[PDB]
Design a protein around this ligand. Structure first.
Ligand SMILES: [K+]
Ligand SMILES: [K+]
Ligand SMILES: [K+]
Ligand SMILES: [K+]
Ligand SMILES: [Mg+2]
Ligand SMILES: [Mg+2]
Ligand SMILES: [Mg+2]
Ligand SMILES: [Mg+2]
Ligand SMILES: [Mg+2]
Ligand SMILES: [Mg+2]
Ligand SMILES: [Mg+2]
Ligand SMILES: [Mg+2]
Ligand SMILES: [Mg+2]
Ligand SMILES: [Mg+2]
Ligand SMILES: [Mg+2]
Lengths: 31, 235, 35, 57, 53, 154, 88
RNA sequence: GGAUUAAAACUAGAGUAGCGAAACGGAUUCGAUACCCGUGUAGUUCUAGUAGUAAACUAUGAAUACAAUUAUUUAUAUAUAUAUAUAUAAAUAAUAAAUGAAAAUGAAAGUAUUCCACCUGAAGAGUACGUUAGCAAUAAUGAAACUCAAAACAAUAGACGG
């Protein structure tokens, strides 16, 4: 796939990583 | 008639009077348009417990003998499984004997080497006394001992030459005889074939009946068998 | 030359002729010829 | 657990064939490159003897 | 088409073949053995220059 | 070997494309029978036994001493700027062998697709093997023989 | 002959195994050892089919058993721990 | 099924010059959580482990048979009027044929055979849930609903380019 199309997968991966970091943080405070 | 199958015994000695036999049948698979082999394992009754894993057997349908047994062993077509068991037992005994003999031949060789290391006398020195005593006339008792260390009772110039003989020398002469035989056999047959008249005579002289009436291959083999019977039997 | 060589560093020919009764069966032959 | 567990790489420990070959390689006067001491002692003595005979011809 | 595809070796042909093959293996073993002895002789000639004492 | 036969069929197609007049194939009974059928049917100009280096001019008996160096040499035909032997393909493949009864062979020669085998076309040769003998399908039908449908040549 | 090949491989397997026991991180030569052991299994499996009597004689003399030859072998980490290849 | 597997990351103990996430400062800027500069922690190093992921790419699984040329190296062999010449393989480069959506491939992406892996519109999604494994980060496995008549590749002619 072209770079243009790769960039859509890149954005999805970033948003998943951002959400999992956010969830981790909460667990630390809630723990 | 009763349905009979051919299969390979794939399990034995796990159940009492029961063996597992692998039966392969030929079926047509419409989807891939190919005649395939379909495999199934049968639990089979072995009344005499004769079959062994690896055997090729014929199984025949019987009355129900258990929840899952509906066939029995009817004949051992090939007994490779039984052979395996016999050869394994023999191997244990056969190898033990050989290893014992080899262990005794290794300790014997070690003893001889140790004994020789206890004799400070060296071949060179001993061969320098048998060549000085033979050139000076002195006969110290060392020579008598040397006549026992080597067994050389007589001390001559043709006794040191036989104490220092190397096996390579014998090999060189056996190789020349081997080459001679091959070269002679080829020249003899080569010449014989070149002269049909001398060939026909050759065969008759060696006891062939009407060799003239023979084929090239049917007769060249006779010539080859004779040329190799006149250079290997007479020698 | 082989066995009948004058080199200080000879080849196995000399050692082979010795153990094959050649350097001796030739020395006697030469001496017998001289006789 | 009662199965005869033979190491598939090294085999049974103390195999007479494996042990004897190992011992043969560690014998006192074993030589390399295909030479054997017995043949080397006779060959070296033959060189000396052969030289003397060449010095007696 | 009628000719046989293969003619098996006659027992005599197999005997001469075995003689040549045994000779080939034996000659190579002998030639290697003699080469080693010739190298042992050339090493004896120079061992007077080597130090062991 | 059907694999060897597939190799030969592909080899003949490659040689036809470049228009070489003479080529060699492995020396085996199946290969010889295959080539002989093509020769009698007019697909091959010549069929000679030989060696890896070329066809034999004089008869050379084949023995175990030279079997590994034996080859069969076949001459390809070209007329009017077209190869006579354009295509050569197996029907019965190594991984899917097809055995047909004489009744189904007659249907194949009559325009009916049997077991996905396209029917015999005008001027095409379909070879069948029966009891280790190779013959044209029409000859097998004449002899009432059942056999493996090996290949089709056009 | 398969018996000779197995014996020749045995010598090299024994030597290569000794090397690995002193060079446990030499994965390149561990891979070579694995392949050589598997090659010996293949040659002996053929021997069992070709000459069963010789096969059983050969494996007995080499110190192996039928299971060691016929069973699938990968010389994996569990093997190195179950037979204490490296000791401790 | 097994083994090995970059970088980052983690466990334990050593090491720590230089480099350098982060953090704290200096600049730039309308703003500058940046690009540039300073101080520089983890890390980068070694030992013993965990983990098994990369654009882990030739984006091209492995094996076998086969097909037209040239050039250039390499290797082996042969010869001599001894330094070249003649052979046979391999590698690489450019090609014929053939193949292909074309770009191109070229001894395969050709002609064939055998075996394995994998794919079936886009998005949702390599996500959710469950499970297995790991100290952990995570890794493997891996959907459906809803919505749409799209979506993608090669090539062509333009336009534009700090
Ligand atoms: K019962
Ligand atoms: K540091
Ligand atoms: K790359
Ligand atoms: K694969
Ligand atoms: Mg893709
Ligand atoms: Mg193998
Ligand atoms: Mg640390
Ligand atoms: Mg900085
Ligand atoms: Mg690991
Ligand atoms: Mg990942
Ligand atoms: Mg991946
Ligand atoms: Mg890489
Ligand atoms: Mg391979
Ligand atoms: Mg995941
Ligand atoms: Mg494009």
């Amino acid at each position: 796939d072209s770079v243009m199309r790769k960039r859509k997968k890149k954005m999805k991966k970033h948003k998943l990583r951002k959400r999992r970091k956010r969830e981790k943080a909460e667990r630390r405070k809630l723990s | 008639a009763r349905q009979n199958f051919l299969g390979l015994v794939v399990s034995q000695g796990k159940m009492q009077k029961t063996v597992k036999v692998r039966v392969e049948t030929k079926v047509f698979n419409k989807k891939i348009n190919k005649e395939l082999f379909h495999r199934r394992d049968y639990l089979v009754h072995d009344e005499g417990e004769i079959s062994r894993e690896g055997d090729l057997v014929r199984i025949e349908a019987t009355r129900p003998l258990s929840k899952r047994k509906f066939f029995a062993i009817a004949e051992i077509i090939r007994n490779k499984g039984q052979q395996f068991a016999l050869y394994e037992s023999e191997a244990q005994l056969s190898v033990a004997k050989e290893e014992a003999q080899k262990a005794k031949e290794f300790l014997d060789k070690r003893s001889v080497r140790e004994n020789k290391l206890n004799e400070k006398t060296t071949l060179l020195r001993d061969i320098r006394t048998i060549q000085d005593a033979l050139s000076s006339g002195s006969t110290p008792k060392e020579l008598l001992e040397i006549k026992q260390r080597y067994g050389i009772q007589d001390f001559s110039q043709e006794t040191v030459r036989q104490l220092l003989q190397l096996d390579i020398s014998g090999l060189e002469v056996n190789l020349e005889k081997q080459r001679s035989l091959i070269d002679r056999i080829q020249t003899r047959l080569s010449e014989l074939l070149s002269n049909d008249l001398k060939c026909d005579q050759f065969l008759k002289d060696h006891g062939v009946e009407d060799p003239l009436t023979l084929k090239k291959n049917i007769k060249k083999n006779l010539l080859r068998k004779h040329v190799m019977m006149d250079m290997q039997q007479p020698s | 030359m082989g066995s009948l060589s004058n080199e200080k560093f000879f080849d196995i020919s000399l050692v082979d002729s010795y153990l094959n009764k050649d350097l001796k069966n030739i020395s006697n032959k030469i001496d017998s010829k001289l006789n | 657990a009662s199965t005869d567990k033979v190491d598939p790489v090294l085999g049974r420990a103390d195999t007479p064939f494996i042990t004897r070959i190992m011992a043969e390689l560690k014998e006192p006067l074993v030589l390399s490159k295909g030479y054997n001491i017995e043949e080397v002692d006779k060959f070296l003595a033959a060189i000396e003897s052969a030289k003397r005979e060449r010095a007696e011809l | 088409m009628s000719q046989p595809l293969l003619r098996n070796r006659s027992p005599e042909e197999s005997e001469l073949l075995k003689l040549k093959r045994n000779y080939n293996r034996s000659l190579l073993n002998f030639q290697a053995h003699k080469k080693k002895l010739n190298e042992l002789l050339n090493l004896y000639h120079v061992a007077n220059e080597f130090i062991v004492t | 070997s059907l694999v060897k036969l597939a190799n030969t069929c592909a080899h003949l197609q490659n040689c036809s494309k470049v228009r070489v007049a003479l080529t060699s194939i492995p020396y085996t009974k199946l290969q010889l029978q295959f080539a002989y059928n093509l020769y009698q049917q007019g697909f091959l100009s010549s069929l000679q036994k030989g060696s890896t280096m070329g066809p034999d001019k004089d008869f050379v008996e084949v023995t175990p001493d030279n079997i590994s160096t034996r080859r069969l040499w076949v001459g390809l035909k070209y007329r009017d700027n077209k190869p006579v032997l354009s295509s050569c393909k197996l029907i019965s493949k190594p991984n899917s062998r097809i055995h047909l009864p004489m009744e189904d062979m007659k249907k194949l020669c009559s325009g009916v697709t049997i077991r996905n085998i396209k029917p015999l076309q005008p001027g095409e040769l379909i070879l069948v093997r029966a009891h280790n003998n190779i013959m044209d399908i029409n000859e097998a039908i004449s002899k009432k023989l059942d056999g493996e449908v090996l290949c089709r040549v056009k | 002959s398969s018996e000779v090949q197995a014996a020749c491989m045995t010598v090299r397997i024994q030597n290569m195994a000794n090397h690995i026991k002193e060079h446990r991180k030499d994965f390149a030569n561990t891979r070579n050892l694995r392949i050589l052991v598997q090659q010996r299994q293949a040659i002996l499996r053929y021997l069992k089919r070709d000459n069963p009597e010789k096969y059983y004689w050969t494996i007995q003399k080499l110190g192996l058993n039928d299971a060691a030859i016929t069973d699938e072998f990968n010389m994996d980490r569990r093997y190195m721990q179950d037979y204490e290849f490296f000791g401790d």
